Design a protein around this ligand. Structure first.
Ligand SMILES: [Mg+2]
Ligand SMILES: [Mg+2]
Ligand SMILES: [Mg+2]
Ligand SMILES: [Mg+2]
Lengths: 59, 108, 43, 148, 71, 97, 140, 40, 155
């Protein structure tokens, strides 16, 4: 909570890597959550102009 | 012991209603990370450039590292490192570089 | 590939645009409201 | 136009109004004429309402200058050092009083677009959201497919 | 239908209006019944007097409350 | 001083040393730095969270780009919590006694 | 009495001052500037009208993100918060989600409790059994 | 949203309708003396 | 009992606590919160407050802008009565739909009564020779919120 400006900004806009198993899974439903994570629509700090984006690795 | 949401992430929520009925309260103490769910800090300290003959040259051996590449390879390397496209790293012209605000407003 | 002859909503061959469940529910709701109105306009 | 004009955030000079309120209007100088018909409103305001306004607000230095001028003017200088010049050319006494009250109530800052209607210092009470503030911790802090 | 809605005083949409239960206005209400919602006026507290005209309110359920916001 | 930070005007050099000295004064043995969460290790912009445990009890946590910066930030947070200068502290009282 | 215009310089400048940040000859030629300025003002009005909608959609998206982070859907969260007589708009909800994670999680837990109580009441179909948070409070 | 639930409970379809969020005086002097009434 | 895919609902079953236990737990929680308020272990408090037709999240020593003129002079203190929500680090009071004036008190000082920057409203119609330009100047009021007070009167 009581962080300095630079580390607080870094923590707020930090990138996250997610894992997704694709065995016996529908491509449309996998791509829905993949697109959500890529756009950052899972973050309350999301904005179109902001570069908020998370990496997704699908196996 | 009942809660709509699990108390495993950052706080423990306990909801309640005032006996009057016109007020809702919620006690949400913060949750600290237990010691069992952490891992020790990795420490990497190795100096393979140290030479027993001349430590003065050994010290400069770890600092005399340099490299120069062309614009294309440099942009490709930067894009590969930062997981972006190659179109961002190209420079911009006078028309765009003149119109940038020298002193943008700052909040906080 | 598939062309709509003439204008989209004028000619003899029009767009085959169907009716949706939302439209059906809206029409049912309006019918219920008007039925209540005509009941209240009875006595 | 926001893209055409400048912009600033909602700010207050010297954190005014926190400990105490300070009237940001420092001096108010009227320049009018005694023979120009356009200066009728300024002359009547000086005759009638300037003394009452001075008594109501003692923190502002009021200057009055009759001179052979055609455009009656009012210059307000604020504690920020900002100077705002307005024309009182052919205005009624009520309009002059309204303009003077508006200048007194103004903080002297630039009249441009304000990006946000709010300004809170340190709004991160009880914490600020980060992608790790809602994700439960696993036993030992292991990666999803890392074997210990 | 436009003229009927004009003479019924329903120019402003989503604003309730009070009318009689007489057949003379019932005819127009039948004519434009497909554009209006009609409810019966309810008076749980009776007709407001001259001392309660400034403290009245109209609840959305269809009733008229005489004493509204007592202190 | 409204909205300002203690360290922005104090400008200390060894937050870890100051924290351990304060803990020694307060009769606390030693803080242990443990990696709580992280996001990427081989990436160009890694993110680390380092927490401070005294007797296996978390007292503070800090984020950073690197592990050393995260540990320094965690030490700074612990020092601010110990001194009471926190973002969640009582606002300054402006009244007429 | 031949009358000529002398303030044409200021007449032209009063329009050119709003086009100094354009690209090409539209910032220099007056004939090409008047059309751009008029369309610029029209777009300014349209975007001022659309700004409320855009910010409402952004707030809704942020609320959806924060609610799915707690495993709750946006429509259910909104309807259950409304049922609890909690009149908070999407702007306030987004601000709380961004800056008050504990408060937003408490609100999500309250909404989930309200949803569970409503589902239990619907399953039971019993007038006497009423949820603790499902009680309705009148005005005072 | 949530208009049907408010209508069933008796409240207005819009929370701004005759509710305490609007009928009550939104502000008052620190001394406790009543504020001037609202035009709406 | 047969077990099929559609035999059971596709959501976990929910069990609610007994009403008496829920009332006792709520009483204990509200007593703990009231004890916290009385002891004054709260550092900072934020509040969602409805004012001038808008809902504002406001903490102590903050600034807000209201787009309409108020009938108060500069430097005057005003008590905001419509409190929608109160919150702190550990606790939070939700109004149904509002909190009590005796329970929570919020005060703000008027700073500046000014006029907004000129807003241009221009309507233009194609090939009909219709242009309509207006300049709007909207009076604005600046409020500095200094303190947020909470009373232990909570049963
Ligand atoms: Mg065609
Ligand atoms: Mg056709
Ligand atoms: Mg509008
Ligand atoms: Mg109006």
């Amino acid at each position: 909570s009581s962080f300095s400006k630079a580390p607080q900004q870094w923590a707020t806009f930090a990138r996250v890597w997610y894992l997704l198993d694709g065995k016996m899974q529908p491509p449309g439903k996998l791509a829905a959550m993949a697109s959500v994570k890529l756009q950052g629509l899972h973050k309350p700090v999301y904005h179109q102009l902001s570069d908020c984006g998370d990496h997704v690795v699908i196996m | 012991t009942y809660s709509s949401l699990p108390d495993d992430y950052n706080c423990k929520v306990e909801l309640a209603l005032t006996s009057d009925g016109r007020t809702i309260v919620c006690y949400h103490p913060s949750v600290d990370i237990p010691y069992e769910h952490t891992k020790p800090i990795p420490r990497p300290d190795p100096v393979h450039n140290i030479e027993e003959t001349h430590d003065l040259v050994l010290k400069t051996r770890l600092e005399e590292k340099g490299e120069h590449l062309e614009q294309g390879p440099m942009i490709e390397q930067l894009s590969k490192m930062f997981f972006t496209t190659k179109h961002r790293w190209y420079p911009r012209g006078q028309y765009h570089r003149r119109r940038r605000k020298p002193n943008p407003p700052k909040d906080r | 590939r598939n062309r709509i002859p003439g204008r989209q909503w004028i000619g003899k061959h029009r767009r085959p645009r169907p009716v949706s469940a939302q439209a059906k529910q809206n029409m049912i709701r309006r019918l219920e409201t008007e039925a209540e109105n005509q009941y209240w306009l009875s006595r | 136009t926001a893209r055409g004009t400048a912009s600033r955030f909602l700010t207050s000079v010297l954190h005014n109004g926190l400990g105490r309120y300070v009237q940001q209007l420092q001096r108010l100088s009227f320049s009018l004429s005694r023979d120009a018909p356009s200066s009728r409103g300024a002359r009547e305001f000086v005759e009638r309402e300037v003394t009452d306004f001075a008594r109501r607000n003692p923190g502002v230095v009021i200057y009055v200058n009759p001179r052979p001028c055609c455009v009656p003017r009012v210059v307000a200088e604020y504690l920020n050092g900002a100077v705002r010049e307005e024309s009182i050319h052919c205005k009624s006494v009520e309009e002059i009083a309204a303009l003077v009250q508006k200048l007194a109530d103004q903080s002297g800052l630039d009249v441009i677009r304000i990006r946000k209607p709010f300004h809170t210092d340190s709004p991160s009470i009880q914490g600020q959201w980060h992608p790790f503030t809602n994700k439960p911790t696993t036993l030992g802090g292991l990666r999803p497919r890392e074997v210990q | 239908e436009k003229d009927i809605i004009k003479m019924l005083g329903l120019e402003k949409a989503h604003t309730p209006q009070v009318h009689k239960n007489i057949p003379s206005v019932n005819a127009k209400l039948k004519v434009v019944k497909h554009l209006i919602r009609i409810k019966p006026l309810k008076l749980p507290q009776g007709l407001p007097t001259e001392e309660d005209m400034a403290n009245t309110c109209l609840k959305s359920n269809g009733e008229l409350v005489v004493r509204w916001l007592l202190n | 001083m409204t909205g300002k930070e203690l360290f922005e005007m104090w400008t200390i050099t060894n937050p870890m040393g100051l924290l351990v000295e304060e803990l020694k004064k307060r009769k606390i043995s030693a803080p242990e730095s443990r990696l709580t969460r992280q996001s990427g290790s081989t990436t160009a912009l890694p993110v680390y969270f380092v927490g401070l445990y005294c007797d296996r009890k978390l007292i503070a946590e800090g984020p950073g780009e690197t592990v050393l910066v995260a540990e320094e930030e965690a030490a700074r947070v612990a020092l601010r919590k110990l001194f009471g200068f926190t973002e969640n502290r009582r606002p300054w009282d402006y009244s007429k006694p | 009495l031949r009358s000529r215009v002398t303030d044409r310089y200021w007449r032209v400048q009063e329009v050119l001052k709003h086009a100094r940040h354009f690209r090409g000859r539209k910032n220099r030629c007056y004939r090409l500037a008047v059309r751009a300025v008029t369309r610029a003002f029209v777009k300014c009005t349209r975007a001022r009208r659309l700004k409320k909608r855009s910010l409402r959609t952004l707030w809704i998206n942020r609320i959806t993100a924060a609610s799915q982070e707690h495993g709750l859907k946006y429509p259910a969260f909104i309807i259950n918060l409304i049922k609890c007589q909690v009149e908070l708009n999407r702007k306030v909800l987004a601000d709380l989600a961004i800056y008050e994670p504990k408060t937003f999680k408490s609100l999500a837990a309250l909404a989930k409790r309200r949803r569970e109580e409503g589902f239990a009441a619907a399953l039971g179909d019993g007038k006497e059994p009423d949820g603790i948070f499902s009680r309705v409070v009148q005005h005072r | 949203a949530g208009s049907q639930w408010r209508l069933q409970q008796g409240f207005a379809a819009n929370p701004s309708g005759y509710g305490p969020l609007t009928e009550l005086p939104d502000w008052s002097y620190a001394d406790g003396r009543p504020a001037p009434p609202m035009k709406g | 009992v047969p077990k099929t895919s559609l035999g059971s609902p596709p959501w976990p079953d929910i069990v609610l606590p007994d009403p008496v236990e829920e009332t006792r737990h709520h009483a204990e929680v509200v007593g703990q919160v009231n004890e916290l308020i009385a002891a004054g272990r709260y550092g900072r408090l934020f509040a969602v407050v409805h004012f001038a037709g808008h809902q504002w999240k406001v903490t102590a020593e903050d600034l807000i802008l209201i787009e309409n003129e108020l009938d108060v002079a500069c430097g005057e203190r005003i008590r905001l009565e419509k409190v929608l929500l109160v919150g702190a680090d550990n606790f939070t009071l939700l109004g149904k739909p509002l909190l009590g004036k005796e329970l929570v008190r919020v005060e703000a000082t008027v700073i500046e009564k000014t006029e907004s920057w000129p807003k241009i409203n221009m309507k233009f119609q194609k090939r009909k020779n219709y242009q309509r330009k207006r300049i709007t100047v909207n009076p604005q009021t600046v409020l500095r919120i200094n303190s947020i007070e909470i009373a232990p009167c909570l049963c």
